[PDB]
């Protein structure tokens, strides 16, 4: 009820904002106005060619990092258990392993940029 | 298991979750704990082959508890009946079902 | 792959596989597969050639998809039963849904496509790991669920595997492709007896494992991947190609060698189950296997082949490599027929 | 002279003040003067239904004391 | 109406599921997945799995984010595909949207159905159960048991991510 | 000794961040065992009742459990009230 | 009347986002020996409205090479998240009280990047792709600790509900107990919003305007609110997270005045930082965080899980 | 597969405690101490018989004792309870924290009167 | 079986059809690879919430944690599909046909 009402209201207001923005101002298009911006001169011509960025290795590791942040999120409810001895050991395992994965990721180059 | 070590060295790695009638955090019962309690102690150490025939009329009672298959069939039949005389207008719901 | 990490590269493959035999929970059985899968990829690219990356990827989509189907077969069974224990499935489609997936894990049905393809790019050592170890995990699941597998399902997919597997072998000249089709046919041999008795599939699995072990041992020792390069090996090492022949005879299953006992025991058990036409059909089709074994033997030791002169340089040196256990597997996989009653130990 | 900065944040100070002011008063107005009930658990939600059923007017924020019972 | 709101939320999950499975341009499929993922959060959120919905939402945004970076990095073409431009994806698109249309009609019209399984369409609201959770949420408390009951699951999972960084470096080493 | 102390000093100079993380990270593993309140922490968690203390039938020979939730006999937690 | 509440949480924010622009101009100017806008009305108080009308009546440029459908979704997606991520904030009594408030905080914060992502792609240019991919690089380093700092600080609060944050901070400020985390959270909140030392994605001197290069009029005007409404909301998030003020149960006025003042003080520091420091490099940013920040997070999170158990100070769940 | 047995309408008739949430919570502590014998026997039967239909009469007994406890709280300490339950009611979570002062008056009232 | 379980099950069905029925982009295929995780995750979450299976409530995230691992190594297969072949389209990798 309330949550999607809040969600619906927000997208509606945004839609009107772009609607009056994109319609009202008395457009005048003459092709070169719509031409791509290339810092004053013409584009060399591409912008969809494969932009080979050099942080590929750090990219996937972030995915693996997030997969285990979801694992360590139930800690606030995990602390309210009757077996903190087991819960503390297994909890510290994740951070030790996460540091260990980063440590290998760090020491064997990894984090460093590709040049 | 293929090579049973959980039994051999005597340590539980995955049995605790295998069923829904096992002990749960803060004794939160499952939906069909009564049925899984009865079914499990029905066919225990009697034999998998000697289970599907004798622990049957108790097993589907559990499988109905999970899915409510023929129970939902009952509601669909009743609600289908409602549509076929409300339009025909023989019967009106009692005020208990209005307010 | 760095030596120290190359060890744990293989360690999680073994333990990831070992998780499949020892677990009793379906999710754990599921978990054991990607731990096998995710760590199996890098060793396939240990050499890291464009063919290796080619070989690894076709494995990944084939294997990841098969594990993906594996997941729902658990879920539909869970939805219709509510148990995770490794027992019979309680819903027929989930059963067939699993058997379809585990085959792609195994290369039984037309899925067998991926098996010869990946074997070429991945090295001989990687192949030694692939056709031997990567089959233990799916077999363990099938043996456990053998109670409620559709007999006409497993038999059909087993029959085809020995059919295409034997038949596709009669085109290849690269030993790795020939070897994979041989493994594909043997994949069918164990899986045909799977519903009737599961002791025999272990027995044929064992004989297949040691023979394929000893087989690749010889291939690494000969350091050849093409029949011509293998044809040369009569000169440098005649002992290697001499035993190359004998284990090639165990391939075909020709008695009194070891390779007969898998085919022998399976036919016996199947005939006890009144299936006589089916064992007879695979018995004939196994001759196709033996045929490209004979041609492979023919270019190996029966007939001498043109060598070179720079190979007399090789006579001065020898193999500084060993890997232990080749002498044991030749003996165990050639002379073991007088010990058929030991199969009851598996029981 | 830095005072000129203040008129800017002054209206802004009121601007962020309206939401918290609005929600608190709207909750106070709709829910019978009392602060809006919080249902973070089924027990609270089950408690809220009982109040609504016994209210008669189908409104949780209508609490009847001992005068309701004998 | 909001009475079959879950019936709706289930659908646009699959229209988005269809849209990206029609194999459009890789980032366009990324949009096609996230709409399904976003609405997919809604279905499980409706059933009570608040934590499950938020986590499948949270990390799959993170998962899809890294996908986009790779798509434009070394997986994009100088003439990108659209759901309409290529006829192959257009054929895949149109086939997906009539496949659900003809079926959800059939399921809703007859409410008994036969395909694969038997399905009483009736209403997903029906199978909710008269249960009280007390002062604890089952969907969150059960997950909290991971660190007290699932030590083996923690070990196997945690270990696997560690090689997960090993493989992610092993195979990318480039000689 | 001298090498170890110098390596710490060289660390503390070259990098102050990981040494600080390693130090305070190292402590977070050890003192949980040495803490004399960790046995109290589990007691607090056990004390908090989320489910009902379901009563049990009388058959005699049960002095430990009380017959009324005010009787002196039974598990008492005045330790936690002062704690 | 719930709808009246929704507008009462949207329009008053929108004017707050509007006046942040004027305040930033004047705060930046007065930190520059300048005066800032003071001609548009009195003290320049009419300046945001002057820019307001100009942009929405400015020619909204449609680039030919741009993909139009994705072009328009990005400004909508940017603004929609900005407003809807205000709704769980516990301004005295939160508008939307949910047991998982901070998880919802992270979800739409993570959803926000797809605005600069799709817009960067749809603009179809070099500077467009450069800004969008460095926006990935800037934000890829960013969620990993943002969750950890949120987890570590909240672990002694009791749960993920935002309302109970006030009860935890009833006696002393949260910053007294986790100031090492607060500095690190503050840098990241300064960073998630692409502000001050970390504004590579915009990069005026080095990317002209980055993703915003081909975005004019309202489509630009929308992008400005999403950036600036996230500034105020993130500072408000930090204010409740670390500097939770007292809350009288009978007079919500007291908390509202105190909370708003805390947000204003924090937001000024955002402009304070924006004036002073230079701009990092997106490689150094990633190296700063995954080589120095992230290692400290794990140990600090390690400390903040061990601490409640060792001291028998675990917080109540309900 | 059988009948369903449920006691007829006249069987499940009883006047219910018509007080609201905050009233019950404020008196809950003293209600638990006083009327526990009907509570304990009712829920013990609920857990043992595992069927409400075989435990409806004990449900009647608990309501009557809840009546008598609430009847005497109105007769003697009417006003102090009224301040207590309305002050608890204002809070959005019925927290006992914001009612210590009113609780003190209620506690002493029932300490001497009842 | 309700329509919610229905429409989720049918969702994985065309996820398979998307997965194996291929196209000229390996990325779009692995997009469908992590996509079919959605159905199984959402499917699985529906039952154990419905059955009040408190223990099995961790099985979705455990399933979902392993989910992106396939994608994680899947993306790394892509990059040296690009490193050695420049592009991504799945026809240039055929040297292993022999
Ligand atoms: C998933 C659903 C995808 C539906 C679809 O076809 O999207 C096409 C849509 C438009 O592609 P484009 O690259 O902008 O090219 C548009 C013109 O071809 C090239 O630009 P244009 O300026 O020529 O566009 C105008 C053109 C095409 O119409 C539009 O561009 C209008 C917006 C899209 C309408 C469909 O108008 C017409 O053809 C006549 C319309 C009457 O591509 C998308 O990726 C949008 C998907 C939106 C999904 C829902 C998001 C919430
Ligand atoms: C018996 C089955 C196979 C029979 C046919 C073998 C192929 C035809 C014969 C020629 C084999 C190749 C050759 O050159 O053989 C001679 C070579 C040297 O003789 P060898 O004894 O191994 O070493 C010298 C000291 N004794 O020795 C060898 O190359 C190895 C001969 C192995 C003979 C079979 C052993 C089977 C396992 C016991």
From Swiss-Prot, chain A:
Tell me where in or outside the cell this protein is found: Mitochondrion inner membrane
InterPro entries linked to this entry? NADH_UbQ/plastoQ_OxRdtase_su3, NDAH_ubi_oxred_su3_sf
The reactions it catalyses are: a ubiquinone + NADH + 5 H(+)(in) = a ubiquinol + NAD(+) + 4 H(+)(out)
Q: Which UniProt keywords apply?
A: Electron transport, Membrane, Mitochondrion, Mitochondrion inner membrane, NAD, Respiratory chain, Translocase, Transmembrane, Transmembrane helix, Transport, Ubiquinone
Q: Which superkingdom is the protein from?
A: Eukaryota
To which protein family does this belong?
Belongs to the complex I subunit 3 family.
Tell me, in a sentence or two, what this protein's role is.
Core subunit of the mitochondrial membrane respiratory chain NADH dehydrogenase (Complex I) which catalyzes electron transfer from NADH through the respiratory chain, using ubiquinone as an electron acceptor. Essential for the catalytic activity of complex I.
The record ties this protein, via PANTHER family, to:
NADH-UBIQUINONE OXIDOREDUCTASE CHAIN 3
Q: How does it assemble?
A: Core subunit of respiratory chain NADH dehydrogenase (Complex I) which is composed of 45 different subunits. Interacts with TMEM186. Interacts with TMEM242.
Tell me the protein's name: NADH-ubiquinone oxidoreductase chain 3
Q: What is the lineage of its organism?
A: Eukaryota, Metazoa, Chordata, Craniata, Vertebrata
From Swiss-Prot, chain C:
Q: What class of enzyme is it?
A: translocase
Q: Where is the signal peptide?
A: none
- Gene Ontology MF terms: NADH dehydrogenase (ubiquinone) activity
Regarding the membrane, this protein is recorded as:
Multi-pass membrane protein
Question: Quick one: where is this thing mainly located?
Answer: mitochondrion
A cellular component term from Gene Ontology for this protein is: respiratory chain complex I
- Carries keyword Transmembrane helix? yes
Describe its function: Core subunit of the mitochondrial membrane respiratory chain NADH dehydrogenase (Complex I) which catalyzes electron transfer from NADH through the respiratory chain, using ubiquinone as an electron acceptor. Essential for the catalytic activity and assembly of complex I.
Which protein family is named in the record?
Answer: Belongs to the complex I subunit 2 family.
Q: What is this protein called?
A: NADH-ubiquinone oxidoreductase chain 2
Query: Lineage, please?
Result: Eukaryota, Metazoa, Chordata, Craniata, Vertebrata
Curated annotation (Swiss-Prot), chain E:
This entry's Enzyme Commission designation comes to 7.1.1.2
Q: Which Pfam families match?
A: Oxidored_q3
Q: What Gene Ontology molecular-function terms does this entry list?
A: NADH dehydrogenase (ubiquinone) activity
Annotated compartments: Mitochondrion inner membrane
Ranges that cross the membrane: 1-21, 25-45, 47-67, 88-108, 149-169
Q: What is its main location?
A: mitochondrion
Any Gene Ontology biological process = mitochondrial respiratory chain complex I assembly
List the catalysed reactions. a ubiquinone + NADH + 5 H(+)(in) = a ubiquinol + NAD(+) + 4 H(+)(out)
Q: Which GO terms describe its cellular component?
A: mitochondrial inner membrane; mitochondrion; respiratory chain complex I
Q: Does the keyword Mitochondrion apply?
A: yes
Keyword list (alphabetical) reads: Electron transport, Membrane, Mitochondrion, Mitochondrion inner membrane, NAD, Respiratory chain, Translocase, Transmembrane, Transmembrane helix, Transport, Ubiquinone
Task: Relate the protein's function as given in its record.
Answer: Core subunit of the mitochondrial membrane respiratory chain NADH dehydrogenase (Complex I) which catalyzes electron transfer from NADH through the respiratory chain, using ubiquinone as an electron acceptor. Essential for the catalytic activity and assembly of complex I.
Its family remark reads:
Belongs to the complex I subunit 6 family.
- The protein here is known as NADH-ubiquinone oxidoreductase chain 6
Give the lineage: Eukaryota, Metazoa, Chordata, Craniata, Vertebrata
Gene name, per UniProt, is MT-ND6
Curated annotation (Swiss-Prot), chain I:
The entry describes its oligomerization and partners as: Core subunit of respiratory chain NADH dehydrogenase (Complex I) which is composed of 45 different subunits.
Name of this protein: NADH-ubiquinone oxidoreductase chain 4L
Family, as annotated = Belongs to the complex I subunit 4L family.
Which InterPro entries does this UniProt record tie to the protein?
NADH_UbQ_OxRdtase_chain4L/K, NUOK/Mnh_C1-like
User: In its keyword annotation, does this UniProt entry include Zinc?
Assistant: no
Say yes or no: keyword Translocase present: yes
Its EC number is 7.1.1.2
Pfam families recorded: Oxidored_q2
Q: Where in the cell is it found?
A: Mitochondrion inner membrane
Q: Transmembrane residues, as ranges?
A: 1-21, 29-49, 61-81
User: Which GO annotations describe the biological process of this protein?
Assistant: ATP synthesis coupled electron transport
Tree of life domain: Eukaryota
Q: What is the lineage of its organism?
A: Eukaryota, Metazoa, Chordata, Craniata, Vertebrata
| Main localization, broad class | mitochondrion
Q: Tell me how this protein sits in the membrane.
A: Multi-pass membrane protein
Role played? Core subunit of the mitochondrial membrane respiratory chain NADH dehydrogenase (Complex I) which catalyzes electron transfer from NADH through the respiratory chain, using ubiquinone as an electron acceptor. Part of the enzyme membrane arm which is embedded in the lipid bilayer and involved in proton translocation.
Q: Which reaction does it catalyse?
A: a ubiquinone + NADH + 5 H(+)(in) = a ubiquinol + NAD(+) + 4 H(+)(out)
Report the gene name. Answer: MT-ND4L
Species the sequence originates in? Sus scrofa
One Gene Ontology molecular-function label: NADH dehydrogenase (ubiquinone) activity
């Amino acid at each position: 009820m309330n949550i999607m009402l809040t969600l619906l209201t927000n997208v509606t207001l945004a839609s009107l904002l772009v609607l009056i923005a994109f319609w009202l101002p008395q457009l005048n298009a003459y092709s070169e106005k719509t031409s791509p911006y290339e810092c004053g001169f013409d584009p060399m011509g591409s912008a969809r060619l494969p932009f080979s960025m050099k942080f590929f290795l750090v990219a996937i590791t972030f995915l693996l990092f997030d997969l285990e942040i979801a694992l360590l999120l139930p800690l606030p409810w995990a602390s309210q258990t009757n077996n903190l001895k087991t819960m503390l050991t297994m909890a510290l395992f994740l951070l030790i392993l996460l540091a260990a994965s980063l440590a290998y990721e760090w020491t064997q180059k990894g984090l460093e940029w590709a040049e | 298991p293929f090579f049973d070590v959980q039994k051999r060295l005597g340590l539980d790695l995955d049995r605790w979750m295998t069923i829904q009638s096992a002990e749960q955090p803060h004794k939160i019962p499952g939906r069909c704990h009564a049925f899984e309690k009865e079914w499990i102690e029905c066919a225990h150490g009697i034999g998998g082959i000697r289970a599907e025939k004798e622990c049957k009329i108790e097993f589907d009672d559990f499988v109905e508890c999970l899915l409510r298959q023929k129970t939902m069939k009952r509601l669909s039949a009743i609600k289908r009946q409602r549509d076929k005389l409300i339009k025909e207008g023989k019967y009106t719901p009692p005020p208990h079902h209005l307010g | 792959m760095n030596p120290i990490i190359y060890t744990t590269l293989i360690m999680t493959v073994m333990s990831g596989t070992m998780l499949v035999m020892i677990s009793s929970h379906w999710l754990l059985i599921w978990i054991g597969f990607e731990m096998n899968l995710l760590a199996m990829i890098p060793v396939l690219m240990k050499n890291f050639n464009p063919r290796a990356t080619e070989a690894a990827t076709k494995y990944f989509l084939t294997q990841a998809t098969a594990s993906m189907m594996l997941m729902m077969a658990i879920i539909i069974n869970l939805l219709y039963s509510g148990q995770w224990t490794i027992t019979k499935m309680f819903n027929p489609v989930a059963m067939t849904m699993m058997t379809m997936a585990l085959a792609m894990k195994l290369g039984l049905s037309p899925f067998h496509f991926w098996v010869p393809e990946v074997t070429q790019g991945i090295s001989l050592q990687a192949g030694l790991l692939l056709l031997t170890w990567q089959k233990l995990a799916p077999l363990s699941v099938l043996c456990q669920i053998s109670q409620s597998i559709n007999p006409n399902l497993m038999l059909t997919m087993a029959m085809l595997s020995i059919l295409i597997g034997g038949w596709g072998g009669l085109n290849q000249t690269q030993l790795r492709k020939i070897m994979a089709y041989s493994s594909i046919a043997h994949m069918g041999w164990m899986t045909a007896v799977l519903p009737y008795n599961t002791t025999m599939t272990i027995l044929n699995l064992l004989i297949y494992i040691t023979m394929t072990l000893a087989m690749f041992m010889l291939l690494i020792h000969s350091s050849a991947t093409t029949t011509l390069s293998l044809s040369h090996t009569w000169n440098k090492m005649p002992v290697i190609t001499s035993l190359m022949m004998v284990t090639l005879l165990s391939m075909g299953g020709l008695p009194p060698l070891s390779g007969f006992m898998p085919k022998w025991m399976i036919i016996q058990e199947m005939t006890k189950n009144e299936s006589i036409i089916m064992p007879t059909l695979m018995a004939m089709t196994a001759l196709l296997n033996l045929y490209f074994y004979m041609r492979l033997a023919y270019s190996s030791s029966l007939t001498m082949f043109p060598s070179t002169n720079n190979m007399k340089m090789k006579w001065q040196f020898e193999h500084t490599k060993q890997m232990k256990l080749l002498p044991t597997m030749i003996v165990l996989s050639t002379l073991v027929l007088p010990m058929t009653p030991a199969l009851s130990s598996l029981n | 002279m830095w005072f000129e900065i203040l008129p800017g944040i002054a209206v802004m100070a009121a601007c962020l003040f309206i939401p918290g002011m609005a929600t608190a008063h709207i909750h106070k107005f709709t829910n019978g003067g009392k602060e809006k009930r919080v249902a973070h658990f089924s027990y609270q939600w089950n408690l809220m239904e009982r109040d609504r059923c016994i209210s008669g007017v189908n409104r949780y924020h209508v609490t009847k004391g001992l005068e309701n019972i004998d | 109406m909001t009475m079959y709101i879950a019936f709706i939320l289930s659908t646009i999950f699959v229209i988005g599921f269809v849209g990206f499975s029609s194999k459009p341009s890789p980032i366009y499929g990324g949009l096609g997945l996230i709409v399904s993922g976003g609405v997919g959060c809604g279905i499980v959120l409706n059933f009570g799995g608040s934590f499950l919905g938020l986590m499948v939402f949270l990390i799959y945004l993170g998962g899809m984010l890294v996908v986009f970076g790779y798509t434009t990095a070394m997986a994009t073409e100088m003439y990108p595909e659209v759901w309409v431009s290529n006829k192959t994806v257009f054929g895949a698109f149109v086939s997906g949207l009539m496949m659900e249309f003809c079926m959800v009609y059939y399921a809703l019209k007859e409410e008994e159905v036969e395909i694969i399984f038997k399905f009483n369409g009736l209403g997903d609201w029906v199978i909710y159960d008269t249960g009280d959770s007390g002062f604890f949420s089952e969907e969150a408390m059960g997950i909290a048991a991971l660190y007290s009951y699932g030590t083996w699951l923690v070990i196997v999972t945690g270990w696997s991510l560690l090689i997960g960084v090993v493989v992610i470096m092993e195979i990318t080493r480039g000689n | 000794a001298g090498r170890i102390a110098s390596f710490l000093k060289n660390a503390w100079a070259k990098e102050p961040v990981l040494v600080a993380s390693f130090a305070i990270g190292g402590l977070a593993i050890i003192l949980p065992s040495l803490s004399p309140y960790t046995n109290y922490a589990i007691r607090i968690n056990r004390a908090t009742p989320y489910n009902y203390p379901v009563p049990l039938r009388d058959d005699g020979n049960m002095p430990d459990v009380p017959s009324h939730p005010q009787d002196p006999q039974g598990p008492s937690l005045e330790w936690l009230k002062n704690l | 009347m719930f709808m009246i509440n929704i507008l009462s949480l949207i329009i008053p924010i929108l004017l707050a986002v509007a006046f942040l622009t004027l305040v930033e101009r004047k705060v930046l100017g007065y930190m520059q020996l300048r005066k800032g806008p003071n001609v548009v009305g009195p003290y320049g108080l009419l300046q945001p409205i002057a820019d307001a009308l100009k942009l929405v009546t400015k020619e909204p440029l449609r680039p030919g090479t741009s993909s139009i459908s994705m072009f328009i979704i990005a400004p909508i997606l940017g603004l929609s998240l900005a407003l809807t991520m205000w709704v769980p904030l516990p301004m005295p009594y939160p508008l939307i009280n949910m047991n998982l408030g901070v998880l919802f905080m992270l979800a739409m914060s993570s959803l926000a990047v797809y605005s600069i992502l799709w817009s960067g792609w749809a603009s179809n240019s070099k500077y467009a792709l450069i800004g969008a991919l460095r926006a990935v690089a800037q934000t890829i380093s960013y969620e990993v600790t943002l969750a950890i700092i949120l987890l570590s600080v909240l672990l002694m609060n009791g749960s993920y509900t935002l309302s109970t944050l006030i009860t935890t901070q009833e006696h002393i400020w949260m910053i007294f107990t986790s100031w090492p985390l607060a500095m690190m959270w503050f840098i990241s909140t300064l960073a998630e919003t692409n502000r001050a030392p970390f504004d590579l994605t915009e990069g005026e001197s080095e990317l002209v305007s980055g993703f915003n290069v081909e975005y004019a009029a309202g489509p630009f005007a929308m992008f400005f609110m999403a950036e600036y409404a996230n500034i105020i909301m993130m500072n408000a998030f930090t204010a409740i997270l670390f500097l939770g003020a007292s809350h009288d149960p009978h007079t919500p006025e007291l908390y509202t005045i105190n909370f708003v003042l805390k947000t204003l003080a924090l937001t000024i520091t955002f402009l304070w930082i924006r004036a002073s420091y230079p701009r990092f490099r997106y490689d150094q940013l990633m190296h700063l965080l995954w080589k120095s920040f992230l290692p400290l997070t794990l140990a600090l999170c390690m400390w903040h899980i061990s601490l409640p158990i060792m001291t028998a100070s675990i917080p109540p769940q309900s | 597969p059988g009948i369903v047995e449920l006691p007829t309408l006249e069987d499940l008739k009883v006047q219910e405690v018509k007080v609201s949430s905050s009233v019950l919570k404020a008196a809950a502590h003293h209600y638990g101490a006083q009327c526990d014998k009907p509570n304990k026997e009712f829920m013990l039967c609920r857990w043992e018989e595992k069927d409400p239909r075989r435990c409806l009469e004990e449900g009647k007994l608990v309501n009557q004792c809840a009546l008598d406890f609430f009847r005497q709280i109105k007769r003697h300490c009417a006003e102090p309870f009224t301040e207590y339950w309305t002050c608890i009611d204002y809070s959005g979570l019925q927290l006992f924290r914001h009612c210590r002062k009113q609780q003190a008056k209620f506690d002493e009232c029932v300490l001497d009167k009842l | 079986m309700p329509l919610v379980y229905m429409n989720i099950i049918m969702a994985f069905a065309i996820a398979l059809a998307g997965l194996l029925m291929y196209r000229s982009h390996l990325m779009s295929s692995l997009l469908c690879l992590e996509g079919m995780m959605l159905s199984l995750f959402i499917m699985s979450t529906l039952i154990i919430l419905n059955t009040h299976f408190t223990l099995a409530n961790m099985m979705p995230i455990i399933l979902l944690v392993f989910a992106a691992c396939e994608a994680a190594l899947g993306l790394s297969l892509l990059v040296m599909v690009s490193n050695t072949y420049g592009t991504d389209y799945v026809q240039n990798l055929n040297l292993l046909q022999c």
